[PDB]
Amino acid sequence: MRAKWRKKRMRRLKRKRRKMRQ
Amino acid sequence: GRMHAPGKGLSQSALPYRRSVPTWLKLTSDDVKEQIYKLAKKGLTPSQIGVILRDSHGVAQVRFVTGNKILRILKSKGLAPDLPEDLYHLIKKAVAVRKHLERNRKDKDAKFRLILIESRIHRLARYYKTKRVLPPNWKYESSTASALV
Amino acid sequence: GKCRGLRTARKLRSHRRDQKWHDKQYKKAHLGTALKANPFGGASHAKGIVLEKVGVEAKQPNSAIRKCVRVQLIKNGKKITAFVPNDGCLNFIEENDEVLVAGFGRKGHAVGDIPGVRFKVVKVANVSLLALYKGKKERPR
Amino acid sequence: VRMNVLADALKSINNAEKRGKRQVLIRPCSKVIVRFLTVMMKHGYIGEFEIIDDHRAGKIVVNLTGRLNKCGVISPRFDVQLKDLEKWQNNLLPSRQFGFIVLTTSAGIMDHEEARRKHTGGKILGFFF
Amino acid sequence: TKKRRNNGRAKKGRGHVQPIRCTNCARCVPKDKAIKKFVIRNIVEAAAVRDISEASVFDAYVLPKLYVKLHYCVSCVIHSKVVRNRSREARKDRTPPPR
Amino acid sequence: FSEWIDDLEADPKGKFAQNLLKKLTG
RNA sequence: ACGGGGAAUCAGGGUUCGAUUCCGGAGAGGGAGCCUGAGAAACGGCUACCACAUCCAAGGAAGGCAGCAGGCGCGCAAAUUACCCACUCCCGACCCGGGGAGGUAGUGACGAAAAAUAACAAUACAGGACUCUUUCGAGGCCCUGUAAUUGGAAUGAGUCCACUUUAAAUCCUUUAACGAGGAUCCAUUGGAGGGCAAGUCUGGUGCCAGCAGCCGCGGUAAUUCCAGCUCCAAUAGCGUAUAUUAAAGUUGCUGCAGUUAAAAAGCUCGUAGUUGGAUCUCUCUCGGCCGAAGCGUUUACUUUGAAAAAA
RNA sequence: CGCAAGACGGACCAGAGCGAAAGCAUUUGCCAAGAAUGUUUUCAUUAAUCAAGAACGAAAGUCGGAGGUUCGAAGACGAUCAGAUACCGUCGUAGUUCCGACCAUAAACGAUGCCGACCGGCGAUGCGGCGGCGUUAUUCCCAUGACCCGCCGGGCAGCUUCCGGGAAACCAAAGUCUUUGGGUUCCGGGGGGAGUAUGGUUGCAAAGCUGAAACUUAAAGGAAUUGACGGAAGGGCACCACC
């Protein structure tokens, strides 16, 4: 996997987690 | 190299080996002292005084004719400036840069250069304070600087 | 480069002390997380109760069923998988008996084909597996 | 900037000796440099040298005899007692049959053998062999 | 590993070089990295020159030329055979082909 | 003697490879 | 994490350990407060509370093994409810009493030291070679091995007396008696592909069972499982797990790296920090061949001297 | 043939210059800087690198204001395709532009910290200075410009070399390293988990800085070599290829 797309997935995961923990 | 630039310039004065008054120079030590006194009364700094003594009077080095340096001569006579010449010129340059920056506020290069000039000013002031040339309470400010100029 | 000055002892010692934490062995042996996560709690052996017999499949290049046992340690109630070393030695073990279990020799690392198994059975029912294996001793009745 | 003018001098001598040159220019000179060079000369490692006097700091033209393997400085100038001299000799010298560790002691600048003879420690300036 | 000492460009002594658009694909390529061709060709072909010169109302009118500057990107310059791959030793050669 | 040399050249990377290479001299 | 003396390892530098018999501290289930006394905030003294717990006729009374043994519990993990004040010392009013301090035995493969399990001759056998002709052969003239060959010599393990030991004792030492030819009075623990010393011998199994720290071996001829034989490694010891030291110049002070293998901050400024060019060659007094009060600005450094618990 | 708007400064333009880096290209003026060279001027150690702290920091992105030509995330269609939520095409929103406030990240690269010394050669080039045949312009003299031939000093680089180094690729630095010590900052310790969780801090947000562990694994990886392969290029051959 391209490293920048792994970074993008991690950032989307972090955003989803931020929505999880408000 | 340079303190605040990547340059590694080598240009500088290369003094001759001999420490003696040159043969062509007929001026006595007291005559050179009187010329220095007149030039200082005219309002010229030791650098300028030495320049015009070298360039028009044949005085290669005032130290080798008088036995004393020009700034020391002026201090002994008592007509030396309150703050040293290099520090005064640094403060003048900083004041000029600050006055430019007030009417040109988008000049980030001017801000960078002002930071460099003020760092040089602070280094010179710290040195002169350790040597007791400046009072220990002397500090450089962004408002009273133009008063000292 | 490194600082070579007569008054750089503090800086050198501090740099060494910070950089030691980037050594895996030093950080493992000086943090406490590894000690607290160690099922044996820092011991060399531990006694446990066999909960079941399991057959762990060897890693991909090899093909075999390694006979292991799920044992719950008496010291902390933690469940681990302990390899039963020799052949026919799983027959010496019965359910809910006490086994003395040691490490597998690699200090918390899996050994050989057996994946995720870091413990081996040394004794079963207070009799060594090697004494039962060679017929020197028989299972207590 | 330039620090440890002795380090620069010894580096110049070493690099000139590696190149096979018969002479090397060392600048600036110093009392420590001259004393180190004299200690080098008494053991026959560099031969004669000349101090050019310019009216700010000296220069030294050192004739090079190709007997020098390595001349080095020890920075910082660790203070060495007579007990630690053997350890320093083992660390820095190629053999016990030759090679000298130069120390500055209260009796002057001299090799380690002369320091043992005078029964004094000091601060290690460098080595040559 | 490094294929070229100059990294396939001429960006020595600066930090940024303005980009240009490839004449073929319109790709953004640094001006010092793009392969530059200056083609000075007769505005009429060598076939049409005879008819055009015969039909000219002037005598020795000399047809004008056409001065085109082409800035190929590396992919397009390789595909168009304007430059080609070279051996590791021959890569260093910088004299233009004699033509 | 040359038996090890010869059986080694049959299978340079076989099962009997480290053994025979060591048996040559070690 | 009680500290140190110190211990393990160590080319040099270092790394780790030090609960543990010596010194110092702390505590006596946890806190706290006291009496007495020279000395205690004492616990084999008292007073409470907190926790736990004993006897009770239920009204009350009595507790403190981190002393020596011994239990329980915990665990991977550690010995006798023995004898004695004979030694060493301590205490007392005391030459006389007492001391689980301490000593002595018991258990003890924690470890450390010494050290058996055979030695020697003849018999021939596989036997060699500076023995000799002429390589061919004679081979007690220079040494190993077949040994279910032979032969006597030696001796301690053991059993048992008598001393000796010691406070009775035991042990060691000493003496005598018996005590060795499968000297069956019978050495083991791991291995035999490489690392790493020692078999591609035989039988079994057939990617199974298993082995294997690592690499790998095993799918019908397995040098690697399971066995037999043989072989080698240490040896009364050897394997295993964990921790740790060296290996590790893979923590680099000595002494590592940072273009691409892991890695120089995007870039300057900047305080602390670290580092910093040349240069400078021992005097007023006192008891006439002396002696000194010193301030020569000091510091680092180096050398010497003193003082510094044994183990 | 005009007019309006916004964007951008081709060719000249270079292994050329300047800037700390990001970055910087129409003319002219103003403003404040700056390196290098020249200096028989002045001070006289005032210096190097730097925790803390601070300035600047492509693009994208975020708030307001202006503008809004082109291009264009998203989006709407049209194609291609087995399918295309893409590549190609027509439109097209944010954005792209300027002003103010944020953000502080890039393969922000020379993947190479800064200061200092030493160590080969050569030809170029930029700036300054010095010296000199000769040509050309200011109608003619010197000065000065443009050339020519050298030298010196810093600078962007290049070629060459058995300097030396390195695993090599390669590097006159990545050399002067077991013959190991010039000064100083940052930073790495097998591969993953993971630049993740968590706490802290910064931000309006997006996110930035700091930043693990459990667990897992015998290899990941660097340089080079030989093959094989290529919807890479160039050559050569053959009526089981063609003309």
Coordinates of N, CA and C in Angstrom, one line a residue, chain C residues 16-97:
Chain C
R16 N 23.9 9.5 27.2 CA 23.9 8.1 27.3 C 22.7 7.5 28.0
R17 N 22.3 8.2 29.0 CA 21.1 7.7 29.8 C 19.8 7.8 29.0
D18 N 19.7 8.9 28.2 CA 18.5 9.0 27.3 C 18.5 8.0 26.2
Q19 N 19.7 7.8 25.6 CA 19.8 6.9 24.5 C 19.8 5.4 24.8
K20 N 20.0 5.1 26.1 CA 19.9 3.7 26.5 C 18.4 3.3 26.4
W21 N 17.5 4.2 26.5 CA 16.1 3.9 26.4 C 15.6 3.5 25.0
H22 N 16.5 3.7 24.0 CA 16.2 3.3 22.7 C 16.8 1.9 22.4
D23 N 17.4 1.3 23.4 CA 17.8 -0.1 23.3 C 16.6 -1.0 23.8
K24 N 16.3 -2.0 22.9 CA 15.1 -2.8 23.2 C 15.3 -3.6 24.5
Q25 N 16.4 -4.2 24.7 CA 16.7 -5.0 25.9 C 16.7 -4.1 27.2
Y26 N 17.3 -2.9 27.1 CA 17.3 -2.1 28.3 C 15.9 -1.6 28.6
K27 N 15.2 -1.1 27.6 CA 13.8 -0.6 27.8 C 12.9 -1.8 28.3
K28 N 13.1 -3.0 27.8 CA 12.3 -4.1 28.3 C 12.6 -4.4 29.7
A29 N 13.9 -4.4 30.1 CA 14.3 -4.7 31.5 C 14.2 -3.6 32.5
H30 N 13.8 -2.4 32.0 CA 13.8 -1.3 32.9 C 12.5 -0.4 32.9
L31 N 11.4 -1.0 32.3 CA 10.2 -0.2 32.2 C 9.1 -0.8 33.2
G32 N 9.0 -2.1 33.3 CA 8.1 -2.8 34.1 C 6.8 -3.3 33.4
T33 N 6.6 -2.8 32.2 CA 5.4 -3.3 31.5 C 5.7 -4.7 31.0
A34 N 6.9 -5.1 30.6 CA 7.2 -6.4 30.3 C 7.2 -7.3 31.5
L35 N 7.6 -6.9 32.7 CA 7.5 -7.7 33.9 C 6.1 -7.9 34.3
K36 N 5.2 -6.9 34.2 CA 3.8 -7.0 34.6 C 3.0 -7.8 33.6
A37 N 3.5 -7.8 32.3 CA 2.8 -8.6 31.3 C 3.3 -10.0 31.2
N38 N 4.4 -10.3 31.8 CA 5.0 -11.7 31.9 C 4.1 -12.6 32.6
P39 N 3.6 -13.7 32.1 CA 2.7 -14.6 32.8 C 3.3 -15.2 34.1
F40 N 4.6 -15.4 34.0 CA 5.3 -16.0 35.2 C 5.6 -14.9 36.2
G41 N 5.4 -13.7 35.9 CA 5.7 -12.6 36.9 C 7.2 -12.4 37.3
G42 N 8.1 -12.8 36.3 CA 9.5 -12.7 36.6 C 10.1 -14.0 37.1
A43 N 9.3 -15.0 37.2 CA 9.9 -16.3 37.7 C 10.4 -17.1 36.5
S44 N 11.1 -18.2 36.9 CA 11.7 -19.1 35.9 C 10.7 -20.2 35.6
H45 N 9.9 -20.7 36.6 CA 8.9 -21.7 36.4 C 7.6 -21.3 37.1
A46 N 6.6 -22.0 36.8 CA 5.3 -21.7 37.4 C 4.4 -23.0 37.4
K47 N 3.7 -23.2 38.4 CA 2.7 -24.3 38.5 C 1.4 -23.9 38.0
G48 N 0.7 -24.7 37.3 CA -0.6 -24.4 36.8 C -1.5 -25.7 36.7
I49 N -2.7 -25.5 36.4 CA -3.7 -26.6 36.3 C -4.1 -26.7 34.8
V50 N -4.0 -27.9 34.3 CA -4.3 -28.1 32.8 C -5.8 -28.0 32.6
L51 N -6.2 -27.1 31.7 CA -7.6 -26.8 31.4 C -8.1 -27.6 30.2
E52 N -7.2 -27.9 29.3 CA -7.5 -28.8 28.1 C -6.3 -29.1 27.4
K53 N -6.3 -30.1 26.5 CA -5.3 -30.4 25.6 C -5.6 -29.8 24.2
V54 N -4.6 -29.2 23.6 CA -4.8 -28.5 22.4 C -3.7 -29.0 21.4
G55 N -4.1 -29.0 20.1 CA -3.1 -29.3 19.1 C -2.8 -28.1 18.2
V56 N -1.6 -27.5 18.4 CA -1.2 -26.3 17.6 C -0.6 -26.7 16.3
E57 N -1.0 -26.1 15.2 CA -0.5 -26.4 13.9 C 0.8 -25.7 13.7
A58 N 1.8 -26.5 13.2 CA 3.1 -25.9 13.0 C 3.1 -24.8 11.9
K59 N 4.1 -24.0 11.9 CA 4.2 -22.9 10.9 C 4.2 -23.4 9.5
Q60 N 4.0 -22.5 8.6 CA 3.7 -22.9 7.2 C 4.7 -23.8 6.5
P61 N 6.0 -23.6 6.6 CA 6.9 -24.6 6.0 C 6.8 -26.0 6.4
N62 N 6.5 -26.2 7.7 CA 6.4 -27.6 8.3 C 4.9 -28.0 8.4
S63 N 4.7 -29.3 8.7 CA 3.4 -29.8 8.8 C 3.4 -30.8 10.0
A64 N 2.8 -30.5 11.1 CA 2.6 -31.4 12.2 C 1.6 -30.7 13.2
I65 N 1.3 -31.5 14.2 CA 0.4 -31.1 15.3 C 1.2 -31.2 16.5
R66 N 1.6 -30.0 17.1 CA 2.3 -30.0 18.3 C 1.3 -30.1 19.5
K67 N 1.5 -31.1 20.3 CA 0.6 -31.3 21.5 C 1.0 -30.3 22.6
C68 N 0.0 -29.4 22.9 CA 0.2 -28.5 24.0 C -0.9 -28.6 24.9
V69 N -0.9 -27.9 26.0 CA -1.9 -27.9 27.0 C -2.2 -26.4 27.5
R70 N -3.5 -26.1 27.6 CA -3.9 -24.8 28.2 C -3.8 -25.0 29.7
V71 N -3.0 -24.2 30.4 CA -2.8 -24.3 31.8 C -3.1 -22.9 32.4
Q72 N -3.8 -22.9 33.6 CA -4.0 -21.6 34.3 C -3.1 -21.6 35.5
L73 N -2.3 -20.6 35.6 CA -1.2 -20.5 36.6 C -1.9 -20.2 38.0
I74 N -1.4 -21.0 39.0 CA -1.9 -20.8 40.3 C -1.5 -19.4 40.9
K75 N -0.3 -18.9 40.5 CA 0.1 -17.6 41.1 C -0.8 -16.5 40.8
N76 N -1.3 -16.4 39.5 CA -2.1 -15.3 39.1 C -3.3 -15.6 38.3
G77 N -3.7 -16.9 38.1 CA -4.9 -17.2 37.4 C -4.8 -16.9 35.9
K78 N -3.6 -16.8 35.3 CA -3.4 -16.4 33.9 C -3.4 -17.7 33.1
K79 N -4.0 -17.7 32.0 CA -4.1 -18.8 31.1 C -3.0 -18.7 30.0
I80 N -2.2 -19.8 29.9 CA -1.1 -19.9 28.9 C -1.2 -21.2 28.2
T81 N -0.5 -21.3 27.1 CA -0.3 -22.6 26.3 C 1.1 -23.1 26.5
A82 N 1.2 -24.3 27.0 CA 2.5 -24.9 27.3 C 2.7 -26.1 26.5
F83 N 3.8 -26.2 25.8 CA 4.1 -27.3 24.9 C 4.5 -28.5 25.7
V84 N 4.0 -29.7 25.3 CA 4.4 -30.9 25.9 C 5.5 -31.6 25.1
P85 N 6.7 -31.5 25.5 CA 7.8 -31.7 24.6 C 7.9 -33.0 23.8
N86 N 8.0 -34.1 24.5 CA 8.3 -35.3 23.8 C 7.1 -36.0 23.1
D87 N 7.3 -37.2 22.6 CA 6.2 -37.9 21.9 C 5.6 -38.9 22.9
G88 N 4.3 -39.0 22.8 CA 3.5 -39.8 23.7 C 3.4 -39.1 25.1
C89 N 4.0 -37.9 25.3 CA 4.0 -37.3 26.6 C 2.7 -36.6 26.9
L90 N 1.9 -36.3 25.8 CA 0.6 -35.8 26.1 C -0.3 -36.8 26.7
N91 N 0.0 -38.1 26.5 CA -0.7 -39.2 27.1 C -0.5 -39.2 28.6
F92 N 0.7 -38.8 29.1 CA 1.0 -38.7 30.5 C 0.1 -37.7 31.2
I93 N -0.4 -36.7 30.5 CA -1.1 -35.6 31.1 C -2.6 -36.0 31.1
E94 N -3.3 -35.7 32.2 CA -4.7 -35.8 32.3 C -5.3 -34.4 32.6
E95 N -6.6 -34.2 32.3 CA -7.2 -32.9 32.6 C -7.2 -32.6 34.1
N96 N -7.1 -31.3 34.4 CA -7.2 -30.8 35.8 C -6.1 -31.4 36.7
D97 N -5.0 -31.6 36.2 CA -3.8 -32.0 37.0 C -2.8 -30.9 37.0

